[PDB]
Amino acid sequence: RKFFVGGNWKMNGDKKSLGELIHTLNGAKLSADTEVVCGAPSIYLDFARQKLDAKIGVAAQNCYKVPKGAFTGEISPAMIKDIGAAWVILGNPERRHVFGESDELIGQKVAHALAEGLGVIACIGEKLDEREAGITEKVVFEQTKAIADNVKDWSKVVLAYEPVWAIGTGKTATPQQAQEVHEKLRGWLKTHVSDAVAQSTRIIYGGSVTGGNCKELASQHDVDGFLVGGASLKPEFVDIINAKH
Amino acid sequence: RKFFVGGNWKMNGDKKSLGELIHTLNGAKLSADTEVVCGAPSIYLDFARQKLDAKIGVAAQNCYKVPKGAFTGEISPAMIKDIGAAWVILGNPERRHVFGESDELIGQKVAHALAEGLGVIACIGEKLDEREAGITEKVVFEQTKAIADNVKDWSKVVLAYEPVWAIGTGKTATPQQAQEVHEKLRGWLKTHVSDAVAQSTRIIYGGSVTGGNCKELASQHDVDGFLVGGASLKPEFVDIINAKH
Secondary structure, eight states: OOEEEEEEOOBOOOHHHHHHHHHHHHHSOOOTTEEEEEEOOGGGHHHHHHHSOTTSEEEESOOOSSSSBSOTTOOOHHHHHHHTOOEEEESOHHHHHTSOOOHHHHHHHHHHHHHTTOEEEEEEOOOHHHHHTTOHHHHHHHHHHHHHTTOSOGGGEEEEEOOGGGSSSSOOOOHHHHHHHHHHHHHHHHHHTOHHHHHHOOEEEESSOOTTTHHHHHTSTTOOEEEESGGGGSTHHHHHHTTTO | OOEEEEEEOOBOOOHHHHHHHHHHHHHSOOOTTEEEEEEEOGGGHHHHHHHSOTTSEEEESOOOSSSSBSOTTOOOHHHHHHHTOOEEEESOHHHHHTSOOOHHHHHHHHHHHHHTTOEEEEEEOOOHHHHHTTOHHHHHHHHHHHHHTTOSOGGGEEEEEOOGGGTTTSOOOOHHHHHHHHHHHHHHHHHHTOHHHHHHOOEEEESSOOTTTHHHHHTSTTOOEEEESGGGGSTTHHHHHTTTO
C-alpha cells in the first residue's frame, strides 16, 4: 500500500498565503513513495490545481449527490472534475457533527462521487463519550458499513480514521490506539468485502498529527498515512509527507 | 431605489457553458439603470469575476459566520472578498429547508458578512402550508426580524422575498400577491427600523421569474427587482434585467 498523506486546509487561506504554501510544496524534497493530496477551500480549488505541481493531487472538501440542480451553495463531482481535482473528502467530522450530515447522505454522496470517477477519502470516527463507553468498534463499523455498502470499486477509496476528540485538541491518539482501530477496520474489510480489498485499501489516521509525532504513528503496521489538519498549513507538512524516512 | 436583478446560477454550469453565458451578458445591452449581480457556484467565483465586465457584480451563494477555522466545506467573507466578489446570498430557501439552516444561524452570517464589508441579498419566504394556513405575514416578519436584528447598516442590504412554493415550480406569485407582501415588508421596516430605511431598501421578488412574467411584476410599486434562478442561465436573463425598458 502506497503511503498516503492528505492535507485538509479546512476554512483557511487566501491567495497570498496559499500561494506561498504551494510554492514551498512545489520546491520541497518530497518522498518519491508518497501520494499527496491537498484539500482546498472550494473557492480556491481552481487556483490550487493551477499552481500545484501535477504530482500533487487536489481534493474538494465536500460535494453533493447529483450532477446539477437547485442546490444553492453546493458543488457537484462534475464541477470538481471540470477544474481538474481528482478527490473529494467526504464524511469529515465537522460535516457530521457541526453541519448535521447523516450516514445515509454521506453514503449517497460516496456512490455519486465514485460514479463520476472521483477518488474518495471517506472519513469515520467516534466521539469521546462513545470511546469511554467502550463502543468505538460498533460506531466505526456502523459508519464504515454505510460507506462500504455504496462502494462498488474500492480502488479509488481511502478510509480515514479520525477520532473526534483528537481533532484540533492536541490530543493525538497514541500509536497503540491508532493501530488498534486500523487493524480492527482492516479485519472488517476482509470479512465483509474481501481479503484483496482489505490488503489494498489505505486506512489513514488524522487528529492532531504533527511533524513531531508522525514517525511513531507511521511505523504502526496498519497506519498507511495521515489526514493532516492544522499542520498542513505549515512547512512541517513536508516532514509529515516524509514521515517514513 | 435602483432596480436590482440578481441571477442565482445555483449548482449549474461548468467553465465551457458559464463562459458562454458570461460572453452573452458582456455583449448584451443591459439597462444602465439596473444593478445586476450573478451568483456563481463557489468553485467558479474567481473565474466569473475575471470574465465578467466590471459593471456586473459577483455574489457568492453562501458563506459561514467566521473568518477562518476548522469548518471543512465552508467559505468565509474574507475569501469571497479576496476573489473580488462584492455580495453574498444568505437565507436562500434551499439552505433553510433542504440544509436546515436556522434563522439564528442566518442572522449570524448576515452580521458577519456586513462587518466584513460585503453586500447581503437576504432571502425570506413562506412555504405553501403557511400560505394556505394564512400565516404569511407572521412567517416573513419573523424571518425579517432575525435579519434586521443583525443589521447595523442597511445601505448594503437587499431583501429578497421568495415564496417557497414559487421556487423552481413554475408557479409564479401574481403581481398582486408579491405587491401585497413587499408593501407589508416595507411598512414593517418603517415601524421597526426607520422611514429612511423603509424608503431606500430594495425589496426584490424571486420565484419562477421569466422573460414572459417580468414586466407585469416589475410595474408593481414596491417590487424593486428580481432574484432569478432557472432563467438566469438563459438568454432571457437579459430581458429580465431590461424589464422596465
